[PDB]
Every structure is written in C-alpha cells, then in structure tokens.
Design a protein around this ligand. Structure first.
Ligand SMILES: O=S(=O)(c1ccc(CCN2c3cc(O)c(O)cc3-c3cc(O)c(O)cc3S2(=O)=O)cc1)c1ccc(O)c(O)c1
Ligand SMILES: O=S(=O)(c1ccc(CCN2c3cc(O)c(O)cc3-c3cc(O)c(O)cc3S2(=O)=O)cc1)c1ccc(O)c(O)c1
Ligand SMILES: O=S(=O)(c1ccc(CCN2c3cc(O)c(O)cc3-c3cc(O)c(O)cc3S2(=O)=O)cc1)c1ccc(O)c(O)c1
Ligand SMILES: O=S(=O)(c1ccc(CCN2c3cc(O)c(O)cc3-c3cc(O)c(O)cc3S2(=O)=O)cc1)c1ccc(O)c(O)c1
Ligand SMILES: O=S(=O)(c1ccc(CCN2c3cc(O)c(O)cc3-c3cc(O)c(O)cc3S2(=O)=O)cc1)c1ccc(O)c(O)c1
Ligand SMILES: O=S(=O)(c1ccc(CCN2c3cc(O)c(O)cc3-c3cc(O)c(O)cc3S2(=O)=O)cc1)c1ccc(O)c(O)c1
Ligand SMILES: O=P(O)(O)OC[C@H]1O[C@](O)(COP(=O)(O)O)[C@@H](O)[C@@H]1O
Ligand SMILES: O=P(O)(O)OC[C@H]1O[C@](O)(COP(=O)(O)O)[C@@H](O)[C@@H]1O
Ligand SMILES: O=P(O)(O)OC[C@H]1O[C@](O)(COP(=O)(O)O)[C@@H](O)[C@@H]1O
Ligand SMILES: O=P(O)(O)OC[C@H]1O[C@](O)(COP(=O)(O)O)[C@@H](O)[C@@H]1O
Ligand SMILES: O=C([O-])C(=O)[O-]
Ligand SMILES: O=C([O-])C(=O)[O-]
Ligand SMILES: O=C([O-])C(=O)[O-]
Ligand SMILES: O=C([O-])C(=O)[O-]
Ligand SMILES: [K+]
Ligand SMILES: [K+]
Lengths: 422, 425, 436, 425
C-alpha cells in the first residue's frame, strides 16, 4: 500500500518519459505540502477572523503591497495578522509561524525612491521578516535597499523582484547579492513579449535552484478566482507547473487581496502544490542537484548532503535540524529531499523566514535553556519529534535523520544521526 | 560555415547542456526562434469565426484544423460553416507553393449507454460532408471507439478517430482506448469536473507521455486562453499553460470559446502561434530523443527503420528539413514520433492525408497538384523539388542548407526505405 | 569547473592534478578514458588486498617480514599438498613475522591466515581429508577458508558444519572453479561470506576464452551484493622465473582492480618462485594506479541505484558517510567496529576515502582485509570508565595513527562513524571533523 | 524468436546500468556475429611456409607484419612473396577470398634524433614491394611522421602510417602525433621500459579512448599471448589481456613472437579469434553508442551524416550487416567509428583499400573483380548483390534478414549520401 501512494511507482522509473507514463490520479499524496503560500493582505482578507481561516487553509507568508494604502492602513493589517497568528500560540506543539513581507512600491520614473526609503524604514520599525524589492535592475539596487534598512534591518531577507529586461540580463549579479528572487510576471509580461515570460520563469527558477536560494513565482496564478469559486484549467496547470519547475513559494495577489474567495484560493493552491510535489522526478532531480552543487569543506554543507542522501536510503519521514539562523535547514532544502525538514529554532524571526525554503517546517522552541547544553539539544530534538507526531509527520517505527552541531552558536553543524521513532 | 549567430538562436546554447538543470539555466529570452511552429492549432468555428474573410485571417494567423462542435448548432448551421472554411482555404490554391491545407474536425455531442442516436446522425453527416477527423466525446472503453468506427459506415473508414478522455473510467481504461484510437484528446473541461481539479495536470502529463510513447497524436484542449474571450491579452497563467502543454509533448493545442464566441478570435490564434514557437525551441532534445529511442521497441518495418535513421541524420547536420513523400501520411507520422528539430515537409497527392497530418507535431503538409510523369523516378524527383521550392518560399530553406529526403523503392503506400542527404542548390 | 573552483582555490591546482582527479571530473566514460594521465600520481593508500600463497619460497620468518613490508595482507596455505606438520610450521612462521611489528600501531600490520582446501575431487560431497583439514584450521585459529570446487549452496553448508561450533567466526569464501558453480552462483553467494574466481581450474572446466566473462559477471554480482570477491591464478605467472612481469600480466592485475575485485592473489609467484617479494611489490604498484583510474562518478551512482532501500541504521549511516566523503574529498572515514560489519557496509559503496577501521577484535582486524579500502587498526588500550570517553579515545587513536602513517594531514576533513551504545550493530552516527 | 535474444549477450545488452550489464554476462550466451577486431600476425621462421600461411589465413589472420628490426631485405622479400602466394591461392572463389594486408614495422631511430638511414632504406623497400601499412617505430612528435611520409615519396602516397607510441614524449605529444597519423599502435614492449610497467595500462586506455574519439584505428601490441610461444595454451592473464584490449576499444590485436618464432603460430591466431568474438559481444553498446554520438561534433559532410544514420538504423532493426560501397575505404571507416553491432561489409574494386580497411574494427572487405556494367545503377546493384552473396556464403546473412545499404548518388569517391533498408531474399 505504501509503495502505491505519493507517486512511488512513477518515482522508480528509469526515464522521465516512463515517469510521465506512470503518473496515477489514484496515487494519493502522503507528504505535507512543501511549497509555501504567500497571500497578499487586502480588504477581502484584513479581518482577524478572515486571517485565522487563511492560516488554517495554508498561508505561510502575508504580503503587504506598499504600492497602494497608507502607513496607518498597513500597520493595522500587520496588527491583525499578528493577532490571528498568536491566537494559536497556546498549543506550542502545533503553532504555525507566519512571515510578514513588505512589497515596495518601486522606483518608477527615478535609484531608490524617497517613498521606498520611508516604507523600508517603516518595515524595520514594524519588524517585517522579508522585503520584496520591486524593479531590481542591477546589484547596486539591492545594496541601496540594504543601506535603507540600516543597522537595525540586518536580519531582514531581501527578495529581488525581476520585472524587466535589464533585471533578466543582469540576473546573475542580482542573485549573488540577494537572499532570493521573485519572478514578477505581471510587469515582466509587459516589459518583455508575453510569450517569452515562461522562458524567464524557467531560467530564473533553474538558476535559483542551482544557487540554493529561494525563488517565488508570482502574479495571475489563480486570477479567475477573484470572481469565480473555481479556477480555470490553465490556472491549476500553471500552479502545478511552477511547483514542478522548482519554485520555493507560490503567491496569491488580487485573489486574496480583493477577491470574493480568498480562503478558497489558498485552499486551491494547497491542494495543487501537494499533488505537484509528489509528481517531482527525484531520481533525476537529486542527481543533477548533487552533481551541480560545488565541492565544499564547510561541515554544514558536507553534513547536509550526507543527511539528504541517508533520508533517501531509508525513506525517512523527516530530517529534524537545529538551526539558529535557518542556514542548516536551507542547506538541507537545496538538495530537495522528499523527507520533510523540521527546523527547531529559538529565533522567532528565523522561524518565520525559513518559510521561503521549500520543505522547511519551522518549530519555535520557547522553553528556557537547560544547564547542560547536551540536554538542551536533546530536549529540542524531542520537541521536534513530539510536534512531528502531533502534526501527522511521524508515526512510531518511522526513521528520522537528526542534524546537530558540536558546540553552541550558529555555523557548527557537523553531526547526522539516524533515529528510530519510539 | 554556419557562423556564431546561428548557434545563439533557437535556444541552441540550452540544447548543448549536459543536464536538464543546466538546460533550464541556459534558456535565453533573447534567443529568437528560427524554426516554423510545429504544434498544430485547432480553432473552434462559431459565430465569432464564421465569415469567409474572418476565416482567411485565421488561416494566415496559423489555424491548421477547424473544429465544429456538434453539441451546439444544427446540421444546417455546421454545413454552412464547412462551406465557409473550404471557401477561405481554396482562396489560396492559386499560389501552389504557399497553399496551406486545413483539416475539418467534427466534435460529437456524446452519450445513455451506447452510441447515442444523435451521434449516429452526426457521424453520418460527417462522412457525407467529408470531414477528416472526429473527436469522439466521453470515450470510456475500447468498445466505444469500435461503435464510432462502425458508425463511420462504409464511406468513412479513412476518417481519423481522436478519443476524448473526459472522465475517471476513460483515464483508467486509457491503454485499451489508445490501442484502438488514432489519437487522444485530453478534454480538461469535463475531466476537471469528473475528477478533482487539482489532479487534471497529472492526467494530462500521463496521457501526453503515453501518446508520445505510442507515436499517436495527443491534443490538449479547453481554457488554454480563456480570458481572451473578452480581453485582448491572456493572463500569465494562460501563456504558461500553452507553453507547458507544448513542453509536455502535445501534438495539438486547441481554442474553443476563444475562437467560437470571443471578441478576439484572430488574436487568440496569433497568441497560440507565438507561444508554441518559443516553447518548441525550449524542448531538451538531447534527453527527449534518447528516451524516445530507448523506449521505442525494435522494428523490422523498413518505414520505421528509415524514420529513425533520418531523424538521427537530421540531428547530426542540423538539417533544415526532412522532406518525405507520403500517400497516407504514415511515413511522416513515423518521423514525427522521434520529435526531430528539423521540419518534416510531407509531400502528398492525397488531399485527405494532407489535412490529416496536421495531427502530427512538426509535419508541414504540401499538396502536390501537378499531373504524373511517365517515368516514376522523374515524378518522385519533381515532388522532392516541389518540397524544396515550397520550403524556400516559406522560409524553411536557403541555398547551402542540408535536407534529408525520405522515399521508397516503388510506387504505392508502405514501401518507404530510402534516406538521402541533399545539399540545397 | 564551477563545482570545483572554491576547493581548487583552497587545496590548489596541484591537488586536482594528482590521483586521476581530471579524469574523475569527466562527464562520460569516454572522456574519462581520454583524460587518464601517466603523470597523475596516485596519492591514496592501496585499497585492494594482496593474498600471497605461502610455500618453500616464502616460508622463512625473514622472508615473511619482507613480504609484510611489501604489502601482503592475507597469507594463503594450500592444503592440496603438504602435511599438517608443514602447514602448522608455516602458520607459526607467519605469526612470528607478524608479531615482530606489534610494538606500535604505525608498524603493526595484522595479517589474515586463510586455509585453501584440497577439494572433493572424484567424490560428490565433502571429502574426508577436507573434514580433517577444516578441523585443523579451527584448532589453529585461521580467519578464512577458501572452499575449493563449490558447486551448490549445500557444499558451503557442509564446510560450515565441518567447522563446528568453535569455527563459527571463520569467513567462508567459495571458490567457483567449474560450470555448475557458475550456473548456481546466486545460491552459492547467498550463503557464502565471499567468492573466489579460481581461474586455473575454471579455465579448463570451461573454454579458456570465456573465463573473462565469468570473472566480470562474478565481480559485478559480488559488488552488487556487497560481498568480497577475490581474483586468483596466473596474475603475474612469468614472475616465477623472471624479475619483471609481461605486459599482459600487469594489464590483467589492473583490469581485475578496475573490474571491482576486493583482493588479488599470488600463487606460484610467492609459493615457489624466485621473486616472491618482487611479485608482492608489483601487485602493490599496479593496484594503486588502477584504484585511481576507477570512474567513481558512474560507479557510485550505479551502486546507489542498484542497492535496495534499507531501514538498517548501519546501512543508512554508511551511505550518508560515503556521500559526505565525496563532497569534501575527505582523506578518510574512521569507523568503530566490533565485527567489521560497519567497515564492510562503508566499503560496498566504494569510497575514494580510506576506511580506517578501529577495533579491539584481533580476528575482525584480520578479516576486514577481505573488503576493499578497509585499513584495520587494532586498539590495545584497556577500557575507560565512561563509554563516551572510551569511544573518543578510539577515534583519537584513529586520527593519530592516520597522521603518523601518512593517511591524514592537518587541515584535512575526516568522516567519523560511531554508534549510540556499546556492542555490535548500533552504528547510527556520522560526524564531520576537521583535523587539527 | 526467444533463442535469438539469449545469444550474443543480448540480455546483458538490454541492461540499464553498466553494473547490471556485468551481472547479466552469460558464459552460455554464444557469439553470433563475425569477429570484428583484426588480427595482425608477425611473419618469421615459424610462419614462412606457404602451407602454414594458408592455415593462418583460415584461422583469422588479416594483416601480416614484417619486423624490419632484424632480417635482411632478401629475407623480407621472401616473406612477402610467401604471404602473397598463400593469399592468392584463394582468389579462384571470389565470394570467399580474404584480402590480407602487408605491414612494414620499421627498426626505429635508436640513438639518433630523426629518421635513421636504415629506416629510409626500409621505407623505400616497402614502397617498391607495395606494402599497405607502415608501423613507424618510436614516433616522438608530428615532425617524425612527416619524415616517414617524405621517405615514402610520391609513390607511397597511398600507404597508411600507424605511429607507434613507445616512450614518454610520444605519450605527452600524443594529440599532435594522432592529428598527422592514419592510426596509432600502443607498443607496450618498449613503453613498459620507458615508463613504469604499472603505468602502461593507463597509457593504453588513454590512447584507445582518444583514437576511438578521433575515429582513427588503434592497435594493441606485445606479449598478448606470450606464453603460447612454447605452450599450446595461454595463461589466464593472457586471455584476460586480449579480452580487455577488445573491450577497451582496440581496432587490432597483434601477435609478435607467438607467430614469428613460436611453436604454435596457428593456435595463437585461433586463440585471439576465439577471445575477440566473445569480447565483442560483451561490449555495452547502449553506453558506447550514446557516448560516441555525444562526443562526435556536428558534421555537414554527407558521408559522415549518412554514416550515423545507417548505424542508428542498423541498431533499430538488429541488422545483420551494413553493406557499403567504397573506393578509398573512407565510407566504411566512418561507419566503423560509431561501433555498430552489425558487420560493415565493404565492397570495393581497389585491392589496396580492401587490404587497408582491416585497420578499422568491424569492416569486412570484399574485392570486386567483375568488369563494369554499361549502366552505373546496375553496376552498383551488382556490387550490392555481391556483398549479399558473400555474406550468405560466409554465414553473416540468412534469408529474411534486414541489411542497411550505403551508397552515393554518382561514381567516384566522396559522394556517399544514401542509406537504404533492404530485406534479404
Ligand atoms: O523533475 S525533473 O527530474 C525533470 C527531469 C527531466 C525533465 C525532462 C525535460 N523534458 C520535458 C519538459 C517538460 O516540461 C515536459 O513536461 C516534458 C518533457 C519531456 C517529455 C518526455 O516524454 C521526455 O522523454 C523528455 C522530456 S524533456 O527531457 O524534453 C523534466 C523534469 C527535474 C526538474 C527540474 C530540474 O531543475 C531538474 O534538474 C530535474
Ligand atoms: O598447485 S597445484 O595444484 C597447480 C599448480 C600449477 C598448475 C599449472 C596449470 N594450470 C591449471 C590447469 C589445470 O588443468 C588445473 O587443474 C589447474 C590449473 C591451475 C591451478 C592453480 O591453482 C594454479 O595456481 C595454476 C593453474 S594453471 O592454469 O596454470 C596447476 C596446478 C599443484 C602443485 C604441485 C603438484 O605436485 C601438483 O600436481 C599441482
Ligand atoms: O597443468 S598441469 O600439467 C601442471 C600442474 C602443476 C605443476 C607444478 C609446477 N608449479 C608449482 C609447483 C608446486 O609444487 C607448487 O606448490 C606450485 C607451483 C605453481 C603454482 C602456480 O600457481 C603456477 O601458476 C605455476 C606453478 S609452477 O609451474 O611453478 C606443473 C604442471 C596439471 C594440471 C592439473 C593438475 O592438477 C596437475 O597436477 C597438473
Ligand atoms: O621483436 S624484437 O624487436 C624484440 C623481441 C622481443 C623482445 C623481448 C619481449 N618483449 C617485446 C616483444 C616484442 O615483440 C616487441 O617488439 C617488443 C618487446 C620489448 C621491447 C623492448 O625493447 C624491451 O626492452 C622489452 C620488450 S619485451 O620484453 O616486452 C625484445 C625485442 C626483435 C627480435 C629479434 C631480433 O633479432 C631483434 O633485433 C628484435
Ligand atoms: O569504472 S566504471 O564506472 C565503468 C566501466 C566501464 C564502462 C563501460 C561503458 N563502455 C564504453 C563506453 C565508452 O565510451 C568507451 O570509450 C569505452 C567503453 C568500454 C571500455 C571498456 O574498457 C569496457 O570493459 C567496456 C566498455 S563499454 O562499451 O561497456 C562504464 C563504467 C564501473 C566499473 C564497474 C562497475 O560495476 C560499474 O558500475 C562501473
Ligand atoms: O639481449 S636480450 O635481453 C634479448 C631477449 C629477448 C629477445 C627476443 C627473443 N625472442 C624472439 C626472438 C626473435 O628472433 C624474434 O623474431 C621474436 C622474439 C620474441 C618476440 C616477442 O614478441 C616476444 O614477446 C618474445 C620473443 S622471444 O623472447 O622469443 C632479444 C634480446 C637477452 C636475454 C637473455 C640472454 O641470456 C641473452 O643472451 C640475450
Ligand atoms: O543553522 P545555523 O544557524 O548555523 O545553526 C546551527 C547551530 O545549532 C546548533 O545545533 C545548536 O546551537 P544552540 O544550542 O546555540 O542553538 C549548533 O550546534 C549549530 O551550530
Ligand atoms: O507514407 P506512405 O503512405 O506509406 O507512402 C510512402 C510511399 O510514397 C512513395 O515514396 C512514393 O510513391 P507514389 O509515387 O506512389 O506516391 C513510395 O515509394 C512510398 O511507399
Ligand atoms: O560494526 P559493528 O560490528 O556493528 O560494531 C559497531 C559498534 O561499535 C561501536 O561504535 C562501539 O561499541 P563498543 O563499545 O562495543 O566497542 C558501537 O556503538 C557500534 O554498534
Ligand atoms: O568511401 P569513398 O571512397 O568515399 O567511396 C564511396 C563512393 O562509392 C560509390 O558508392 C560508388 O562509386 P563507384 O561506382 O565509382 O565505385 C560512390 O557513389 C561513392 O561516392
Ligand atoms: O509586482 C509584481 O509582483 C508584478 O509585477 O508581478
Ligand atoms: O468537450 C471538451 O472539449 C471538454 O470537455 O473539455
Ligand atoms: O585453486 C585455485 O585457486 C584454481 O584452481 O584456480
Ligand atoms: O616495437 C614494439 O612493438 C615494442 O617495442 O613494443
Ligand atoms: K462536443
Ligand atoms: K620494429
């Protein structure tokens, strides 16, 4: 029964053609949904009750579009998101952190516009986790956003939005200095011929997967759901194809901001992403990712590829990793394991930010530190196992891979352990 | 010999990649498509696309197959549409090197347990009006195809039957349906209601894969450019959907309401044309050819043996085209199954085979109207020269190019066995 | 070039030109052949073990000491000829030469003792002489038995039963010497600890031109099973009378290593020849060169693809450790083992990194020579009060011995494989450590 | 039938990995194809008897080597005369005549820097006696090959020059030597002294790989069956060495002392024949063909384009043979570089080309002696029938088999452009 679920017959295929032939509509997805859902917050989804339903449906990141709306409006939206998120903080084994992202208005006619400087300052003051920098054309644009965040905004992730021809041409220099990329298809589809956008999407997803950096596919994914309760055949196909391409996050804009079915749009993306993740051809994908990743003498990098390889060998349910900054979880995520990466952290910001990485399920550990560090590490691993059993990831008898370091502080990951559940 | 500029067009840097990941990374928005569009466009004929002037613009935009939906309209309405399509198509027959054959397909209303009474009448209509293809609605098992084949009566055994998979039973019995059908249509509209909407992409990918494996045409249909019914430009998801159906391996892409009732029927056809050209260049031929080769079984049929030899030779020299002489279309279909980058120019005297080969990706049919020569070898050579003259006129060929020429050793269908390398002079 | 640029900056261009590293980066096997360089020097220690047959030419304690220094790992006693008294004297001489180096771990090289049976000859089952010879082996504490003319699985069960209750730890290597053995190979392999491709008898039981097919099929199936495979007979035959081998002989040795043989053997070359030490040195030299010419990119992928899924943590940790060793060009994988099993599971994935096996079992230290790439270290210190400290002392012993023997350098990365509790069968931890 | 797919290692050929391929190798899977690696036998006291030479030709000798390291010009002229007499004794039955090449192995430069005076005399002797191949000893750089070419003068323009790599400089300057040579000989005897004995296998594997990549013949020589000089059976290392040279990709394998001066010259030739047949079936064509196509660059030469198409078509139908018409041997050489499993039967009128194509693996030369037909197309068809008749007589072909035929569109060398699929009647 196990080998007939989650497209396991199609996963055993020796060719991609044989893999397509073996895809089964009756082979049910078992794994948790890995691709994160970014929902834009607007009038259709601003109430605390609305937001609680959206978190339950699968929203991981809340986007604030600073193109329209006042600072007062956006501060109220942030307060509402935080209130809906913290309403679930009473049960720590099931708490789902939700990141807050600020989408800048952009340079328009102008370098960094004065409104952008004010909006970036607002973001730092309100503790946003991510910034979607609009119309990034070169590496110096990213540096300008980083300087506008100042010394207080060091921890904020900068995701560069590629929306025009120059951004696509200077992609490699932009990616080198950004934390991730957003394929902003709306403006891109106007700046370049509409029929070429899929080429830019596929090239950018490929290069981000190669770099190990998050990539977001955005705009008009379920557009018809703004007025209709069901998406078109092209829309469900578009979402599935962005996941198959290798997108870390999928986004909803007007569908959640102004539409009549914001919760239904989130549920629809959740349903499609789960099916698409099972249809991934891991045999070729893992080989190509493994081959392309450079040789490294960084123990975190070395332990990560050992852990992903071991997870494939035993069909591990999860890889539990201890992380301070999210880096150890991100290095596991780049090799695209089929096993869920349960990241246990004390940093609330790192817990929200790891939603950018496909397959990372953040767990915020709130307990106070133990006297003996080894015991504190062991307690955090047990917390990961308990939350895993509670959320359905783990069952007794399952194998898990545990990734830890030899000393406290970030950057010392070097241990991988094979563990039997209970 | 070819120059540095040549190797920067039609995604040639991405084609040289050693991995699919490297291939994705090398895709360039500035690498212009050079090859002609190989995925055929099926347009549904309706109120928005009925006039002879409108049909002439649609043929110029890229329509290869005209669909008549027998769920709507009447026998009289649909007979007038057929007459209008034929009139617009024949308006270009005066320039024989640039004439474009256009197939006519009848989409049945559907089933009741057996073949409905209306379907029997609509199939009789189809045979009487000389349709080339039938899209059989709601095919659930092989016996459904046999019923359609029997209803095509005495005079219509040459009509192609494309089975529409629109429900769970069709998907489950797919292999038996494909065995007895000429091709498949992934009818996403009904399928998306009969099975969960989020599973349709799995059925589409499985079905395209199995059709590519079988060497039979596969059509992706419904809501491809849906928003273009009222808006002059499609959504980002729509252009992506069309590109992905071509990348998946679809032989044909379809327009329904976009051409039947929409405000932009010509623009919808142009949009599908533009996307398909870009998507065809993005195909990773290195892996695709090897996998098609590896999966295909051994053959002792000289037509199949010559076909794989010709495709292999076309890849070796970056041949502009493979010119094939075909009576029934079979030799062109066997070349098409290996997915060459080179255009398959099929020269035929059969007007029905010329229309029907639009079902096969990369087959450009040419209807030869000249009278036969006394010596067969001369007649064969004249038809090959006609393929070269048409290829030069339409832009496929230039002097100095290499083409592969596929012929047989004797007249009549079924004797293809020769492959020749020719330099265009 | 991008997948090695940073490591090229760190380790230098000289590092990437040694041990056929340009040929290892090749995308095709054809490109790999084209890139093989006679100026690319082997760096890693020799991983294919050398089995030398003991005889009049290699019996003296002084001769045996020179052979151990030249690279002999396993000493074979051919029971086809010679009395029990003769073979007991050879065992005594081998043990005396081996123990002459037991002062320190950087000199000590544990050498296994293997008994090659006479065989069934005319008879159907286990001959009376074989029963007597097998009981002699148990009484003298041999580590391996090369069972001659194994024709079916029941033959290996007869050898196991003849070893009795005390010989339960002895490894049984079945010799395939005829057509029936080749046909029933799968059933024989399933019940044996390993296989020997006994080409001498095989070459007259089947057509001489077919022996290479049997050798390649058998090595392939043993590599697939993760069981040791020995290539034997006439490898350096001309060296019995000549100081240098023929061009076909050096090629044969290299090809057996490239095929995937865990051990290569010398028979008449060491037992009766005029150059026993030179024959051992020649096999050593060829095996190092051949090991570097292996195309690990394809071999590792195929070994993974073919290996079934496992829920045994020892197996899961083993593949994780080998994968991590390839990622950082690790000098070694240090593994703690009681029976040798953890070292064997690392060895089946054919790492380029040396597997340094730290063990307290002298028998396991001798027996791991059957596995390609396993370098046994016998730990002689008495146990610590705290097990975690005892484990850490054994790991440090491995590092110190690796540094002192040339296996490791400061700045190198090593992969350390251990278990969560004492006793055999609990391996589950992989650690990435930087040598300081 | 089932029986067919159990012979010539066909189960091991279907394997998806090289490891699975090794596991599937069967000692009971009998070779069916003819032996494709040529056997070079050195002539001497053991093999000068015209009766002994006839037995060696029957055993499988394709090329006869004269070692100019020793022996007078009188001695070597007698050896040539005896080889020609034994070869021409079979000319009376043209469907079974086996051409045998004569190769001159030079003494070398020794202490000197350039072409020695003795080498000039021996090269002039070779041209005067009509040798087909020269094995130039101790080639250290491209200029050494040019010196041998100049010493052959204008009359020796047709002689093939195979450079022997016997030292470190030759291995280091390999690419420049290969560029100007017709082929390479891995001269392991001297090479094993000039470089450490344990490194010779690396030089052999690198050189065979680069020659296979270039499409140029490579010979593996020295001590292959050394023990057979005095013993009737080889050692286990010897049979393994021969098999491994064929598996590596060697076009020719050589016997030196074993045939020139030993006690079992015919048995040594038979032994090489037996091993080469088994080893050729054990080649993993699935990987080899893919790597050879991937490594070969795009070509606009119709001979090269037709060659890869023909090899691909031969694999598709399990063709018994590829019959090719050749004047210089070039068309057969281009087929041979892709390493087909099908025998390349080369039909030629040039006696020199017939002898020289023995350097290419899988090429079986047929010397066509009949006078030309009035119509060229008929003359071409008679030559194709001659290949079929020789093939049937020699065991390569049976009625019902498929054969690929490679020809050109006009007489003269360099016009190969046609590939045809033919059913044997
Ligand atoms: O999921 S993967 O393993 C993954 C691996 C390989 C490929 C093949 C890419 N081709 C293609 C692209 C499509 O979009 C599509 O639907 C169908 C086909 C196709 C169909 C065939 O029937 C066929 O035989 C070959 C192709 S194709 O090679 O042209 C796709 C995906 C992964 C995905 C993304 C990566 O970055 C990666 O490294 C690997
Ligand atoms: O060590 S022997 O068994 C022994 C020693 C040498 C040889 C030489 C001939 N070969 C061969 C031929 C056979 O028909 C056969 O049956 C076995 C073998 C064989 C076996 C081997 O184990 C081996 O090392 C070499 C060969 S071989 O292929 O060369 C045979 C046999 C012994 C040694 C001393 C003797 O008095 C005696 O009669 C036999
Ligand atoms: O092929 S035979 O004619 C045949 C068999 C045995 C011999 C013995 C000669 N040698 C020898 C003698 C020994 O006392 C010994 O301990 C080892 C070796 C030996 C071992 C080797 O591994 C090796 O390769 C060569 C030799 S050796 O040549 O030096 C001669 C000839 C036949 C075949 C089968 C037999 O079983 C048999 O007894 C004789
Ligand atoms: O055939 S010979 O060239 C000639 C014949 C035999 C030997 C010894 C056997 N070996 C060998 C065999 C050959 O067939 C060959 O070509 C080269 C080599 C070779 C060359 C070396 O220079 C070397 O040092 C060692 C070897 S080898 O030991 O591997 C040397 C030489 C000739 C034979 C007889 C003569 O009278 C004569 O002048 C030359
Ligand atoms: O070292 S390997 O990675 C490894 C070893 C060999 C192969 C062979 C692929 N072939 C091939 C392809 C080429 O382009 C070429 O130029 C030569 C040959 C070749 C050479 C030979 O010497 C030969 O014996 C056979 C062939 S082949 O035709 O089969 C692949 C891979 C390993 C060795 C053993 C294994 O079990 C395994 O999985 C992999
Ligand atoms: O000068 S030597 O090193 C010295 C040693 C050997 C040799 C060649 C002797 N052979 C031989 C003799 C021939 O005329 C001939 O046409 C071919 C071959 C030959 C070829 C081969 O291909 C092969 O592999 C072996 C031989 S062979 O050994 O039978 C020359 C010279 C020396 C060695 C030992 C002595 O005791 C001595 O007096 C001289
Ligand atoms: O992924 P990061 O940010 O490098 O953090 C991983 C770190 O987490 C740990 O496992 C636990 O460290 P702390 O106890 O200080 O949180 C370290 O050993 C390791 O270095
Ligand atoms: O593709 P099909 O229908 O089998 O037809 C291919 C046939 O066309 C030809 O090339 C030309 O034949 P005709 O001259 O009769 O049209 C035949 O030699 C070959 O058999
Ligand atoms: O390879 P084996 O025989 O399973 O032994 C590995 C064992 O060695 C250890 O690392 C150390 O155990 P000991 O204290 O018994 O020596 C165990 O944790 C592990 O189970
Ligand atoms: O292999 P080569 O030397 O190029 O010769 C091939 C030539 O042989 C032919 O098939 C027959 O030519 P001839 O009749 O002149 O011998 C030519 O058409 C072709 O050009
Ligand atoms: O800003 C965006 O997200 C866009 O344009 O798609
Ligand atoms: O009938 C159709 O085309 C459908 O259902 O998609
Ligand atoms: O006993 C052996 O090793 C043989 O016969 O090969
Ligand atoms: O000349 C040769 O052939 C040699 O020296 O090996
Ligand atoms: K319909
Ligand atoms: K010579």
């Amino acid at each position: 029964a196990f080998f007939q679920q989650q497209q396991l017959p199609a996963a055993m295929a020796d060719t991609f053609l044989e893999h397509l032939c073996l895809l089964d509509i009756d082979s049910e997805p078992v794994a948790a949904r890995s691709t994160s859902i970014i929902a834009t917050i607007g009038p259709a989804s601003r109430s605390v009750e609305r937001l609680k339903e959206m978190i339950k449906a699968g929203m991981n990141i809340a986007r604030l579009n600073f193109s329209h709306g006042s600072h007062e409006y956006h501060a109220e939206s942030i307060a509402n998101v935080r209130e809906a998120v913290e309403s679930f903080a009473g049960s720590p084994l099931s708490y789902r952190p939700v990141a807050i992202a600020l989408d800048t208005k952009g340079p328009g006619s102008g370098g960094l516009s004065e409104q952008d400087v004010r909006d970036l300052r607002f973001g730092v003051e309100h503790g946003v986790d991510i910034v979607f920098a609009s119309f990034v054309r070169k590496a110096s644009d990213v540096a300008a956003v980083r300087a506008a965040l100042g010394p207080e905004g060091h921890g904020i992730k900068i995701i560069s939005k590629i929306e025009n021809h120059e951004g696509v041409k200077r992609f490699d220099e932009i990616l080198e200095v950004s934390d991730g990329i957003m394929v902003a298809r709306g403006d891109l589809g106007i700046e370049i011929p509409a029929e070429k956008v899929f080429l830019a999407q596929k090239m950018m997803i490929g290069r981000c997967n190669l770099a190990g950096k998050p990539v977001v596919c955005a705009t008009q994914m379920l557009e018809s759901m703004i007025t209709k309760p069901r998406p078109t055949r092209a829309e469900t196909s578009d979402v599935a194809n962005a996941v198959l391409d290798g997108a870390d996050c999928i986004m909803l804009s007007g569908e959640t901001a102004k539409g009549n079915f914001p919760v239904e749009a989130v549920k629809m993306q959740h349903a499609i992403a789960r099916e698409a993740e099972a249809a991934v051809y891991h045999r070729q994908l893992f080989e190509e990712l493994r081959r392309a990743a450079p040789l490294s003498r960084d123990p975190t990098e070395v332990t990560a590829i050992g852990a992903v390889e071991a997870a494939f060998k035993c069909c591990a349910a999860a890889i539990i990793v201890l992380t301070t900054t999210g880096r150890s979880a991100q290095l596991l995520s780049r090799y695209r394991p089929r096993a869920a990466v349960i990241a246990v952290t004390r940093s609330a910001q790192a817990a929200r930010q790891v939603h950018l990485c496909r397959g990372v399920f953040p767990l915020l550990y709130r307990e106070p530190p133990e006297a003996i560090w080894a015991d504190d590490v062991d307690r955090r691993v047990q917390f990961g196992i308990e939350s895993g059993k509670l959320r359905g990831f783990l069952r007794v008898g399952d194998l898990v891979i545990v990734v830890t370091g030899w000393r406290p502080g970030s950057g010392y990951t070097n241990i991988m352990r094979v563990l039997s559940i209970s």
